[PDB]
Amino acid sequence: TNRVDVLDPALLRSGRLDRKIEFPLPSEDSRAQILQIHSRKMTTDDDINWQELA
């Protein structure tokens, strides 16, 4: 779910959804990893320096 503040407390709390795992925005280094697994499918060159774009 993307709104967790809204759901009432009987749906949350430990013993129901024990773990509450947060997702952070990709950090500046992760952007580099991310751009590189989607580009493999299409054509690439060595012109590109993914470090820049991240």
Ligand X SMILES: Nc1ncnc2c1ncn2[C@@H]1O[C@H](COP(=O)(O)OP(=O)(O)OP(=O)(O)O)[C@@H](O)[C@H]1O
Distance from C-alpha of 32 to C-alpha of 48, rounded to nearest angstrom = 12
32/27 Cα distance (integer angstroms): 9
| 24 is a site residue for other proteins (CB under 8 A) | no
Q: Which does 24 bind (CB under 5 to 8 A by kind): other proteins, ligand X, none?
A: none
13 binds, among other proteins, ligand X, none (CB under 5 to 8 A by kind): other proteins
- From residue 42, alpha-carbon distances to 19, 38, 39, 54 in Å are 37, 8, 6, 18
The correct pick among 3, 5, 15, 24 for binding ligand X (CB under 6 A) is 15
15 vs 24 by CB, closer to other proteins? 15
